[PDB]
Each structure stands twice: as structure tokens, then as C-alpha cells.
Design an enzyme around this catalytic site. Structure first.
Site, short mmCIF file in Angstrom:
data_model
loop_
_atom_site.label_atom_id
_atom_site.label_comp_id
_atom_site.label_asym_id
_atom_site.label_seq_id
_atom_site.Cartn_x
_atom_site.Cartn_y
_atom_site.Cartn_z
N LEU A 33 0.80 -1.23 0.00
CA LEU A 33 0.00 0.00 0.00
C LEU A 33 0.83 1.28 0.00
O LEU A 33 0.45 2.28 -0.62
CB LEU A 33 -0.99 0.00 1.17
CG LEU A 33 -2.09 -1.07 1.15
CD1 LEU A 33 -2.87 -1.04 2.45
CD2 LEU A 33 -3.02 -0.90 -0.05
N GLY A 34 1.97 1.26 0.69
CA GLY A 34 2.85 2.41 0.75
C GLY A 34 4.18 2.14 1.42
O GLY A 34 4.39 1.09 2.03
N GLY A 36 6.84 4.43 3.87
CA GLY A 36 7.32 5.60 4.58
C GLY A 36 8.75 5.33 5.03
O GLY A 36 9.31 4.26 4.75
N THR A 37 9.34 6.29 5.74
CA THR A 37 10.69 6.12 6.27
C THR A 37 10.76 4.91 7.21
O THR A 37 11.77 4.21 7.23
CB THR A 37 11.19 7.39 7.01
OG1 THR A 37 10.22 7.80 7.99
CG2 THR A 37 11.40 8.54 6.03
N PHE A 38 9.68 4.66 7.95
CA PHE A 38 9.60 3.59 8.96
C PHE A 38 9.69 2.17 8.40
O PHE A 38 10.09 1.24 9.10
CB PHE A 38 8.28 3.71 9.73
CG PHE A 38 7.05 3.64 8.84
CD1 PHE A 38 6.41 4.81 8.42
CD2 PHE A 38 6.55 2.42 8.41
CE1 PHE A 38 5.29 4.75 7.60
CE2 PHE A 38 5.44 2.35 7.59
CZ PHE A 38 4.80 3.51 7.19
N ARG A 40 7.16 -0.37 5.51
CA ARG A 40 6.08 -0.50 4.54
C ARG A 40 4.72 -0.80 5.18
O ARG A 40 4.65 -1.38 6.26
CB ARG A 40 6.41 -1.59 3.53
CG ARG A 40 7.46 -1.20 2.52
CD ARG A 40 7.44 -2.13 1.34
NE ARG A 40 8.56 -1.87 0.45
CZ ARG A 40 9.74 -2.49 0.52
NH1 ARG A 40 9.96 -3.42 1.44
NH2 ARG A 40 10.70 -2.18 -0.34
N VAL A 41 3.66 -0.40 4.49
CA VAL A 41 2.29 -0.76 4.87
C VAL A 41 1.75 -1.70 3.80
O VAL A 41 1.69 -1.33 2.62
CB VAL A 41 1.38 0.49 5.06
CG1 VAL A 41 -0.05 0.06 5.41
CG2 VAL A 41 1.92 1.41 6.15
N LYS A 57 1.69 -2.84 9.08
CA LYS A 57 2.81 -1.93 9.05
C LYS A 57 4.06 -2.71 9.45
O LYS A 57 4.21 -3.12 10.61
CB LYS A 57 2.56 -0.76 10.02
CG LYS A 57 3.54 0.40 9.93
CD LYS A 57 3.27 1.43 11.03
CE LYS A 57 4.20 2.64 10.94
NZ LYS A 57 3.87 3.70 11.96
N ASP A 154 3.14 15.24 14.28
CA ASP A 154 3.39 15.08 12.85
C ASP A 154 2.11 15.03 12.04
O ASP A 154 1.99 14.24 11.09
CB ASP A 154 4.29 13.86 12.56
CG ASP A 154 4.97 13.95 11.19
OD1 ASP A 154 4.86 15.01 10.54
OD2 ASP A 154 5.61 12.97 10.76
C1 LIG Z 1 -3.57 2.29 4.27
C2 LIG Z 1 -3.87 2.05 5.72
N1 LIG Z 1 -4.89 1.42 6.17
N2 LIG Z 1 -4.89 1.37 7.52
C3 LIG Z 1 -3.79 2.01 7.96
C4 LIG Z 1 -3.39 2.20 9.28
C5 LIG Z 1 -2.20 2.91 9.48
C6 LIG Z 1 -1.44 3.42 8.40
C7 LIG Z 1 -0.19 4.17 8.67
C8 LIG Z 1 0.55 3.94 9.84
N3 LIG Z 1 1.69 4.63 10.08
C9 LIG Z 1 2.16 5.54 9.20
C10 LIG Z 1 1.47 5.81 8.02
O1 LIG Z 1 1.94 6.75 7.10
C11 LIG Z 1 1.14 7.43 6.11
C12 LIG Z 1 2.15 8.32 5.35
N4 LIG Z 1 2.81 9.23 6.31
C13 LIG Z 1 3.24 7.48 4.63
C14 LIG Z 1 2.68 6.45 3.60
C15 LIG Z 1 3.63 6.39 2.37
C16 LIG Z 1 2.54 5.03 4.22
C17 LIG Z 1 0.29 5.11 7.75
C18 LIG Z 1 -1.86 3.22 7.07
C19 LIG Z 1 -3.05 2.50 6.90
#
Ligand SMILES: Cc1[nH]nc2ccc(-c3cncc(OC[C@@H](N)CC(C)C)c3)cc12
Length: 349
Positions: A33-34, A36-38, A40-41, A57, A154
Site C-alpha cells: 500500500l505504501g 514511509g521512512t519507517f 512498509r504498509v 505496518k 506530525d
Molecule cells: C492504508 C492504511 N490502512 N490502515 C492504515 C493504518 C495505518 C497506516 C499508517 C501507519 N503509520 C504511518 C502511516 O503513514 C502514512 C504516510 N505518512 C506514509 C505512507 C507512504 C505510508 C500510515 C496506514 C493505513
């Protein structure tokens, strides 16, 4: 797979997986799904929960992200404790665990962020009724944090997710075009990896640049008010489609603040240890230079961004303006924000 661009790269420390892998004989990976620095989701089927669709996550096996994850988990456990029904609009955590050094947190699955919907829609601003509902939920979710001695730190459009980001192509006669509009404006606040309890160590620099409060920049100490500053910037952004503070530099940022909001209070200028930015008790910024021309031309006093003279639009800017008060102690609290006339066009649930 992408190209690594430096020694210290964002691509390092991730858990390697392939679509179809099961983690711990439980979580079947469906898609990514994505990132971030941390870490992946990832979207997963949870096979030990009736096949429920979840967001997993998967945190990098790097100590600083592992530390941030532990703090986030602790914050989410507080959120679950104080909000068992998942009613206060902060994302719900299901489970967490350590997978070979990679922390994994399971959440309810959500749609695209309010930023990514905006981006994909050509930065076409949200209509005001959507701004109202989105802003209201944002204030509710973060007020809940402020009630429980927490500061998110943040807040930004990327961390505000639509419950469902499905859209309609509605006809707009004014422009002779069709336009995307999210069917439902229900949202959740996510990412609590920087969330800080009143009693914990406060990092000096918090918030992503665009959403950073002046007390953070000038290092005067920050608490809950710095979230309200961020919210003010976010709401502005929903209304016009672009960031209020488009900059990556303290001096320029502070100049833009002065241009948009008026002079910084002397008390803050004299108290800060960041004297480098100031001369003779005022911001050291020459408006007549090419740097000054840029700020003069690319931003203006806040109210001038109004795209309508209707009272409901002025009410919105009353809200933003009160959230963007320089002195954290004078800034609108979130409890006050929920009582603001701008939100009135909604009746209690
Ligand atoms: C899609 C989705 N469904 N449910 C979720 C629950 C939590 C999270 C989430 C948790 N921690 C950090 C996040 O960053 C958002 C953004 N800063 C960076 C993106 C590129 C990932 C997102 C996403 C979720």
C-alpha cells in the site's frame, strides 16, 4: 525494485516479502500500500480472524524505527484503552508483534490519504462542505489525544486517511468539466510514531516542515498547541489545494509567516536561542533582495486567499487565523475549535 541512491538509503532495512507470502502462518500478503521512512504498509488477509482484510505496518530492522514503533504501540494501546469502541477517529490497532527484528503492527484497513486523493485529483481543492467535515473530524481525533496528555506532532494530509476513498465523477456545469469527489469524507488519523506524552522526552525538532509551529522552529518548547498550528495549515491546504508554507528553510519560513500573518512577537524573538535569524530585535530579512521578492510574490496575508465573500468562507478563515496565532498560549485550543461557528452546519451525532 528501485535504484539505491546513497549509502544511507531509504530502501535499506525492510523485510523482504513477495505477494502470496504468509507471515507467521497468519497474515497473507495481498499487496503493498505504501512506503514511509519507517518501513512498509501492506494489505493482508488475517487467516486467524476470519480472513478479515487488514493493513500491516512492517517496520525496518533499524533501531531508531524500532524505538519509534515501541512508542507508537504504547500510544495505540492507550488509544484502545480510552476508546474501546474505536469512536474517537484515531486508527484502531488490532495486534502487534516482533518478526525477526521487524516490528509489525496490524490495523483496520483504510483508503487513500486526504493528500493522495487531492494529488491524484490534480490538487483540485476540496469543496467547503467537505473541508468542514474533514476539519471537524481532525479536531475531534486530535482533541482526544490532547485530553489524554498526548501530542501527535506530525499531523499532515498524508496521515489523515479516508475510511473509503471511492469517488464520483460529478458534473460541473460552471467549467464544462467532470470532477472527482470522494463519496464519503469519514477519516482516521494515523502514524503515532512521533506521538509524545506530556511527561516523556520532547524532541527539539518535530513536525514535517510545512506544518511546523513557530515555537518549534525557534526552539521555545512545544506541547499540544503545536498540533493546532499543524491543523491550521492542513485546513488551509484542503481549501486551496497547495501548502501554506512552501519552503524548506527556517529564515524563509519565518519570513513567509510574517508576510502571511504579520510580525513575530518580540517576546519570542528575544527568548529564542536562534538569534541568527534576527537583527536589532526583528527578523533579519531584506524584502528588497531576490529572496525577499520571492516571498513577497508567492504568498500574501492569510485572508486574501478567500475564493468567496460568503460568511461561511469567512468563518473558515476565522478558524484558520485563530489556529495560526504565534503565541502557543494564546492559540485556539481544540476544545474551543469544536465550538467554532464554522462547524455549526453540522448537528451532533
Ligand atoms: C492504508 C492504511 N490502512 N490502515 C492504515 C493504518 C495505518 C497506516 C499508517 C501507519 N503509520 C504511518 C502511516 O503513514 C502514512 C504516510 N505518512 C506514509 C505512507 C507512504 C505510508 C500510515 C496506514 C493505513
Amino acid at each position: 525494485s528501485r535504484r539505491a541512491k546513497s549509502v544511507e538509503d531509504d530502501a535499506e532495512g525492510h523485510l523482504i516479502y513477495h505477494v502470496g507470502d504468509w507471515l507467521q502462518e497468519r497474515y497473507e500478503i495481498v499487496s503493498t500500500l505504501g512506503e514511509g521512512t519507517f518501513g512498509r504498509v501492506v494489505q493482508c488477509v488475517d487467516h486467524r480472524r476470519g480472513g478479515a482484510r487488514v493493513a500491516l505496518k512492517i517496520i525496518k530492522n533499524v533501531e531508531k524505527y524500532k524505538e519509534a514503533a515501541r512508542l507508537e504501540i504504547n500510544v495505540l494501546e492507550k488509544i484502545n484503552e480510552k476508546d474501546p469502541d474505536n469512536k474517537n477517529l484515531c486508527v484502531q490497532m488490532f495486534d502487534w508483534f516482533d518478526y525477526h527484528g521487524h516490528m509489525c503492527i496490524s490495523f483496520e484497513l483504510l483508503g487513500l490519504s486526504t493528500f493522495d486523493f487531492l494529488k491524484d485529483n490534480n490538487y483540485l481543492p476540496y469543496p467547503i462542505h467537505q473541508v468542514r467535515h474533514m476539519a471537524f473530524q481532525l479536531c475531534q481525533a486530535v482533541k482526544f489525544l490532547h485530553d489524554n496528555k498526548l501530542t501527535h506532532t506530525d499531523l499532515k494530509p498524508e496521515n489523515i486517511l479516508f475510511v473509503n476513498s471511492d469517488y464520483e465523477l460529478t458534473y460541473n456545469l460552471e467549467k464544462k468539466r467532470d470532477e472527482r469527489s470522494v463519496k464519503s469524507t469519514a477519516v482516521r488519523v494515523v502514524d503515532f510514531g512521533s506521538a509524545t506524552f506530556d511527561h516523556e522526552h520532547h524532541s527539539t525538532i518535530v513536525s514535517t516542515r510545512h506544518y511546523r509551529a513557530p515555537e518549534v522552529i525557534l526552539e521555545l518548547g512545544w506541547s499540544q498547541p503545536c498540533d493546532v498550528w499543524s491543523i491550521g495549515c492542513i485546513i488551509f491546504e484542503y481549501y486551496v489545494g497547495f501548502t501554506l508554507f512552501q519552503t524548506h528553510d527556517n529564515r524563509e519560513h519565518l519570513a513567509m509567516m510574517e508576510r502571511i500573518l504579520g510580525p513575530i512577537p518580540s517576546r519570542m524573538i528575544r527568548k529564542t536561542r536562534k538569534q541568527k535569524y534576527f537583527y536589532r530585535g526583528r527578523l533579519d530579512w531584506d524584502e528588497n533582495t531576490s529572496a525577499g521578492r520571492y516571498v513577497r510574490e508567492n504568498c500574501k496575508p492569510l485572508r486574501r486567499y478567500l475564493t468567496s465573500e460568503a460568511e461561511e468562507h469567512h468563518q473558515l478563515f476565522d478558524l484558520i487565523e485563530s489556529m495560526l496565532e504565534y503565541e502557543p498560549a494564546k492559540r485556539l485550543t481544540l476544545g474551543e475549535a469544536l465550538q467554532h461557528p464554522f462547524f455549526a452546519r453540522l448537528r451532533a451525532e
